[PDB]
Amino acid sequence: MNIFEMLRIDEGLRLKIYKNTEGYYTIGIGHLLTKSPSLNAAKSELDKAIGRNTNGVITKDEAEKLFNQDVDAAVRGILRNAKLKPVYDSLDAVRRAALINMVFQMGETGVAGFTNSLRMLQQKRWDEAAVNLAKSRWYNQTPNRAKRVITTFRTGTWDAYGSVTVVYQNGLPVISVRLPSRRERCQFTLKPISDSVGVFLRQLQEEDRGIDRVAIYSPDGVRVAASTGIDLLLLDDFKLVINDLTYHVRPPK
């Protein structure tokens, strides 16, 4: 796990302008366009960002370029800020990623305003920082996101950011999945010649009653039909969305 994978889990991929949970126009991998309720303002910002007339639609490659630019802008925002830089410098790699995640989401200025939480992080008062961060407007607005980021600060581990992997055993694909109701993964063995996407998704839901939504998408963000054979699915990478989280899956061969 690293900052790039972490943010992709949090943000997913959308190639057309959409409204985020706060009602604001967004595209790509969490690229906020504007807080104004004007779709034409969103498109104008997008066209500047991409360098062409997009009409509200971009390619995966354009989304990824924008994402890399936004991660770089977040890190630069930290390093140039007198309140964020010494906190960042003091933190281990995992907690640094949590701070970058915050800055990516809410901007340099918003995060620099968390004076007390920043002091607590600087002083390695992790439980206190976690308690204090949860009292914020940020947490109130996007609590599932903020819980994951707070867990990362509290523990200095990737406990909130799991992974989905595929390994062949006895000639069959075994898919290990982070489910929302348990910390340790569960493994699913599938029959490629007869099981479908929909079969797999139904097994996930049978396993964890805390799953409210599950779906599979192509690497370009296009929904994969339930009838699709697992053999066909495993010919390429895919995304497995479980509740609010988007996991990238890389099958071997």
Numbering used by the authors: 1 to 163, 1075 to 1164
What wording appears in the published article?
The mitochondrial calcium uniporter (MCU) is responsible for mitochondrial calcium uptake and homeostasis. MCU consists of two conserved transmembrane helices (TMs) connected by a 9‐aa linker with a four‐residue “DIME” motif flanked by an N‐terminal domain (NTD) and C‐terminal domain located within the mitochondrial matrix 11, 12, 13. MCU is associated with many regulatory proteins such as mitochondrial calcium uptake‐1 and mitochondrial calcium uptake‐2 (MICU1 and MICU2), an MCU paralog (MCUb), and essential MCU regulator (EMRE), forming the mitochondrial calcium uniporter complex (uniplex) 3, 4, 5, 6, 7. MCU NTD appears to be essential for the regulation of mitochondrial Ca2+ uptake through interaction with regulator(s) and/or modulation of post‐translational modifications.
To elucidate the structural basis for MCU functions, we designed a set of human MCU truncation experiments for crystallographic and biochemical studies. We determined the first structure, at a 1.80 Å resolution, of the highly conserved NTD of MCU, corresponding to residues 75–165, encoded by exons 3 and 4, fused with the bacteriophage T4 lysozyme at the N‐terminal end of the MCU NTD. The T4 lysozyme fusion was used to enhance solubility and to phase a new crystal structure using molecular replacement. The structure of MCU NTD consists of one α‐helix and six β‐strands that form a central core, two highly conserved loops (L2 and L4) and one leucine‐rich short α‐helix (α2). Hydrophobic residues in the α2‐helix (140GIDLLL145) stabilize the hydrophobic interior of MCU NTD through interactions among V108, I127 and F149. The L2 and L4 loops are stabilized by hydrogen bonds and hydrophobic interaction formed by highly conserved L90, S92, R93, E95, E118, D119, I122 and one water molecule (W1). S92 located in the L2 loop forms a hydrogen bond with D119 located in L4 loop, stabilizing the local structure in these loops. S92 is predicted as a potential CaMKII phosphorylation site 23, and we could expect that S92 phosphorylation induces conformational changes by breaking the hydrogen bonds in these loops and modulates MCU function 23, 24. The MCU NTD core domain contains six β‐strands and one α‐helix in the following order: β4‐β5‐β6‐α1‐β1‐β2‐β3, in which each of the three β‐strands forms two β‐sheets (A‐ and B‐sides). In the crystals of T4 lysozyme‐MCU NTD and MCU NTD‐E, MCU NTDs form helical oligomers around the 65 screw axis in a similar manner. We identified MCU NTD as a novel fold and named it “MCU domain‐like fold” superfamily based on the analysis of the Structural Classification of Proteins 2 (SCOP2) 27.
